[PDB]
Design a protein around this ligand. Structure first.
Ligand SMILES: COc1ccccc1N(C)C(=O)N1CCC[C@H](C(N)=O)C1
Ligand SMILES: [Zn+2]
Length: 139
């Protein structure tokens, strides 16, 4: 679990969004596994606007933060699951690191701010749904 709270927006994994998230839907993209809902209170997270390929992510299955090198946002194949059929997930960045089901929502951050959230993994890899292109999150 996990979310980014920026301004009057809450950013979450689309496969973990609540009834409330869908009742206050602003935007969603199944191909990116992202969903943005509106909030009444102001959020105090800063979004990074950069091309960093190094950062630190929170891994709830280890209660630890890990430094990682990660790929550029791209279309990557993701095995079928209870929420999606087998498909290409866009805007996804992979790193070598620990992740297991339950780690989705953990924030990835670089020196400039929030980069994205854990969305995929397996076999010593972890995938992050990028949010740095969503410029509207700030205006
Ligand atoms: C951190 O995630 C993992 C870790 C280890 C092993 C597997 C995972 N994966 C990949 C997932 O949990 N999922 C299932 C829920 C839907 C996700 C998606 N974006 O399509 C993929
Ligand atoms: Zn950065």
């Amino acid at each position: 679990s996990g979310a980014i709270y920026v301004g009057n927006y809450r950013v979450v994994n689309r496969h973990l969004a609540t009834h409330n998230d869908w009742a206050n839907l602003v935007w969603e993209d199944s191909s990116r596994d992202l969903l943005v809902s509106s909030t009444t209170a102001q959020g105090c997270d800063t979004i990074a606007r950069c091309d960093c390929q190094t950062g630190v992510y929170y891994c709830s299955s280890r209660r630890k933060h890990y430094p990682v090198s990660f790929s550029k946002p791209s279309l990557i194949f993701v095995e079928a699951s209870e929420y999606y059929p087998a498909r290409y997930q866009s805007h996804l960045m992979l790193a070598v690191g620990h992740s297991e089901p339950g780690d989705c929502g953990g924030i990835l951050r670089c020196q400039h701010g929030v980069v994205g959230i854990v969305s995929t993994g397996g076999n010593g890899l972890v995938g992050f749904a990028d949010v740095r292109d969503l410029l509207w999150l700030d205006e």
